[PDB]
Amino acid sequence: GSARARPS
Amino acid sequence: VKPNYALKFTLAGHTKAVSSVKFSPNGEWLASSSADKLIKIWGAYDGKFEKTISGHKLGISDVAWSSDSNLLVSASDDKTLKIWDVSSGKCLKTLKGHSNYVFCCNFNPQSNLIVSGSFDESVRIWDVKTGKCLKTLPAHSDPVSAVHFNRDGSLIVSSSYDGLCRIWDTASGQCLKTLIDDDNPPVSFVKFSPNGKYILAATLDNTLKLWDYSKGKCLKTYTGHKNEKYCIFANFSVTGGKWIVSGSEDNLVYIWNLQTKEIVQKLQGHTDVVISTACHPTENIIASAALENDKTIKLWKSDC
């Protein structure tokens, strides 16, 4: 996936 | 006055979350990046799919255009950036050196440099022609969520989950200014205003703030949207009325009056977090894009 599409 | 953005096109085709959309400086194109490892190029005025650009080994978190609209740079979970020739789709260079996901990227106006930020807590400045990393800035203590050049390229602004916004001298690499506010919530997005006098910074306490960074004063705040978990792009809209534009975790696009701070419009239609918005360089057109349960880009147009 991509980091920006994952929540912190 | 309030804008009247209406939905014109929904662009489907990515198979995972969309992470970022950007209009080309010449207005003709929209580029999108996705967790599906692909960049797609679409016609900005008719929404027609143009082409797919591939080669990253993991998903992409950002994409940016060169000033002449001929190149793209992308930032990927595979720890690299790639520079692409838009007309051929070919990867011209692979920028290696970050030690964790690359999160954000941008060309300078001259477009001889690229700036990147990464989960490895650094900011890197790269030579476009050679692909060499020219400088590595130990910029932050946590992942770097955004990087942006000002209008003459002499400054970089960076933001991070460590709660800091920093302004850097491009040529010397030194930190010119550190902005801190309240209890230092994570800063999830930052960019310069078009004239280079202000910065717009998002923090994960549901707040956007417009700063005079040289004087270190907060001039405006924009609230009412939902932003606690994701690095959502925000924008200055300047082709018509002067608006602030942002996505939101309640699946809406928010538009505020920049001076009064009032919400002037909420755009409905996405079905997941609106991670990215972009404003067309000459027409009153917004592009928006959303995460895994939506996977679409929407194009909106207003009379002002």
Numbering used by the authors:
A (entry chain D): 114 to 121
B (entry chain B): 31 to 334
Lines from the paper:
WD repeat-containing protein 5 (WDR5), a core component of the mixed lineage leukemia (MLL) methyltransferase complex, directly binds to kinesin family member 2A (Kif2A) to regulate these mitotic events. In addition to transcriptional regulation, WDR5 also functions as a scaffold protein, facilitating the assembly of diverse protein complexes through its WD40 repeat domain, which forms a β-propeller structure. WDR5 has two distinct binding pockets: the WDR5-interacting (WIN) site and the WDR5-binding motif (WBM) site. Emerging evidence suggests that the non-canonical role of WDR5 in mitosis is mediated by its interaction with Kif2A, a kinesin-13 family member that specializes in microtubule depolymerization.
